[PDB]
Design a protein around this ligand. Structure first.
Ligand SMILES: [Zn+2]
Ligand SMILES: [Zn+2]
Ligand SMILES: [Zn+2]
Lengths: 89, 513, 77
């Protein structure tokens, strides 16, 4: 051949157990509202309900994980302490 | 020359009064002499014209500043107007320097000029004002006032620090590097809007750590130490966390090389410099540009993903193309090219069959839109005399039916020639600026909510505007209070539980979870 | 002698150790690369300039084709 690839320096991304099909807290979906929002428009003003990402790469609704901060907050999908590393999918 | 003459007059008057008159004889005499000379010359001799205070400071007369400071210090309200005029000159210079009208300014040059001005003023202060507290306070206030004016200055500061950190070609030794870093952090001290600064610093970290390594290998510790004595223990922690992610990545590279060697040295993944990062730390939320992976890299990526998915159970290795690089071995000598995972698919298609066009590279490859145009322009348009992908229809704009060819270009004197079309002159186009502004706005909007739910759970209640002052004071060192934004956002949580903060029943708030 | 030159002696012994580690790792990586058949039975060694008196390491001469390919593969790795 005329051009042959010798080295490749790709970067791989990964997530723990985000479950796109279902919030592990609310069991609706990774998107499309939560159990305590229901109607998408209602009185939301651009739907403040977003997706919360922690240092443990686990994804839930920001509303879903905000209700669990009051009591024990141990990211119930693992033993890591839940943080807030990214907002929005 | 008036200051020297009046100083000589004061000296001769005091000598005469102490030698030719009684023993004390000096308090009313010197007081009235000062009140007549300085209190009358103070208003007009420093501002009117013809080398007053502003001109004698612009040209850099150290002796004039020193003698003026040592003379006006005796009379009250002299340092006040001195610092007022100095601050006025500083505002004028900053407005002449922070001017936004006009495109085509170099951010690194702008930050270098600002740092040079700051260093010049600090040297003048040290040499003349004898480190007076009032002058330092006035210059600090002036810097806070004219630097916070622009909201794009933090971005230029981040670009300057990235330029200084990428390679220490200027100032090989460490003393001048340390001094320039201290000056940079001092300049950043009198700066607001730290959120955009941190965001752009993290973006620069991602750019410099996901590219060719061995930039400094030691200055990262100095940077994080300075950021812990300036920002604190907030996002500097996430920075060192993604550095640890890089560490984990290299451990994975060596362990996967060992595993491949045990299961038959992977020929497809001969030099698989694959990297593993987390979504939360690095801003890789846009890691889904599904496009055909070249046969050998496809198999290599599949093998790496299978090894990783098993190693750490649950490792969904998403595929992406907008990161990394590669070394293409071309072949009269064998010169190795370089592709930043953008031209790999087009070059592989050319290897499979030459004489392609835009339709061929847009039909049978499943390519995105903007990145396609960017990569095509980088490979074809705006190329110096080292072209690796030539075309017959020589034109600036991109057509559809244009055939692509290849040129030898023996101008490369080594075997490792790279096409570094990316990371060009800092343009900061409107779409990227708008998207990063929206991202930082959402970041602030969630940060304020996090603060209000972390603080107010252990504090008292507000009636009309009591707790908003506290929440703005806690965020005074972060960014602007934005009263309308916080007022519109605090009333959005009333729709559900956890301190709904009922507006009609504002007498008491629900101190529950 | 003491500890004047014995340390450098054991240092060049460690250089030999590093060299044999390099031989085995390059043999392992040879099957991965192997651009041509030039990289066959390779017994390459890696030493440091300071330890061994190899300051005269610039005989610029041509290499046979199979050794040429082997040296190119080793240099690329
Ligand atoms: Zn949920
Ligand atoms: Zn919700
Ligand atoms: Zn977790």
């Amino acid at each position: 051949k005329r051009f042959e690839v010798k080295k490749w320096n790709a970067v791989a991304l990964w997530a723990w157990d985000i479950v796109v099909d279902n919030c592990a807290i609310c069991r609706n979906h990774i998107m499309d509202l939560c159990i305590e929002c229901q109607a998408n428009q209602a009185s939301a003003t651009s739907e403040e309900c977003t997706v919360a990402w922690g240092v443990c790469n686990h994804a839930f609704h920001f509303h879903c994980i905000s209700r669990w901060l009051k009591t024990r907050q141990v990211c119930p999908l693992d033993n890591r302490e839940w943080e807030f590393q990214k907002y929005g999918h | 020359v008036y200051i020297k003459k009046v100083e000589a007059r004061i000296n001769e008057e005091i000598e005469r009064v102490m030698h030719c008159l009684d023993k004390s004889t000096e308090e009313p005499i010197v007081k009235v002499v000062e009140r007549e000379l300085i209190s009358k010359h103070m208003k007009t001799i420093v501002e009117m014209e013809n080398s007053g205070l502003v001109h004698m400071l612009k040209n850099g007369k150290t002796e004039d500043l020193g003698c003026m400071y040592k003379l006006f210090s005796r009379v009250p309200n002299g340092l006040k107007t001195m610092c007022e005029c100095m601050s006025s000159y500083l505002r004028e210079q900053g407005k002449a320097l922070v001017s936004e009208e006009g495109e085509g300014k170099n951010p690194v040059d702008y930050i270098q000029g600002l740092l040079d001005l700051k260093s010049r003023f600090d040297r003048f202060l040290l040499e003349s004002f004898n480190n007076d507290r009032l002058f330092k306070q006035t210059i600090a206030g002036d810097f806070e006032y004219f630097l916070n004016l622009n909201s794009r200055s933090p971005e230029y500061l981040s670009l300057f620090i990235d330029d200084k950190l990428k390679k220490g070609v200027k100032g090989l030794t460490e003393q001048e590097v340390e001094t320039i870093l201290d000056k940079a952090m001092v300049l950043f001290r009198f700066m607001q809007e730290k959120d955009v600064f941190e965001r752009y610093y993290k973006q620069h970290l991602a750019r410099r750590l996901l590219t060719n390594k061995s930039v400094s290998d030691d200055s990262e510790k100095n940077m994080i130490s300075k950021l812990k004595t300036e920002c604190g223990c907030q996002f500097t922690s996430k920075l060192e966390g993604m550095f640890r992610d890089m560490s984990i990545s290299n451990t994975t590279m060596d362990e996967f090389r060992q595993h491949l060697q045990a299961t038959g040295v992977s020929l497809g993944g001969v030099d698989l410099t694959v990297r593993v990062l987390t979504t939360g730390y690095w801003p890789t939320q846009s890691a889904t540009p599904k496009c055909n992976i070249p046969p050998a890299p496809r198999h290599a990526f599949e093998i790496f993903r299978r090894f990783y998915l098993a190693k750490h159970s649950g490792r969904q290795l998403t595929l992406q193309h907008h990161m990394g690089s590669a070394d293409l071995n071309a072949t009269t000598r064998k010169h190795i090219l370089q592709v930043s995972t953008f031209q790999m698919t087009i070059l592989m298609l050319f290897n499979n069959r030459e004489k392609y066009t835009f339709e061929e590279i847009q039909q049978e490859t499943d390519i995105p839109e903007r990145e396609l145009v960017r990569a095509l322009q980088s490979l074809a348009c705006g190329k110096p005399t080292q072209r690796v992908l030539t075309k017959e229809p020589k034109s600036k704009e991109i057509e559809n039916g244009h055939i692509f060819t290849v040129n030898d270009q023996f101008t490369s004197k080594l075997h490792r020639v790279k096409i570094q079309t990316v990371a060009a002159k800092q343009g900061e186009s409107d779409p990227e600026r708008k998207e990063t502004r929206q991202k930082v706005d959402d970041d602030r909007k969630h940060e304020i909510e996090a603060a209000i739910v972390r603080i107010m759970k252990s504090r008292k209640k507000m009636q009309h505007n009591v707790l908003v002052a506290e929440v703005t004071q806690q965020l005074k060192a972060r960014f602007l209070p934005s009263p309308v934004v916080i007022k519109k956002r605090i009333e959005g949580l009333i729709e559900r539980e956890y301190l709904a903060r009922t507006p009609e029943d504002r007498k008491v708030y629900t101190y529950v979870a």
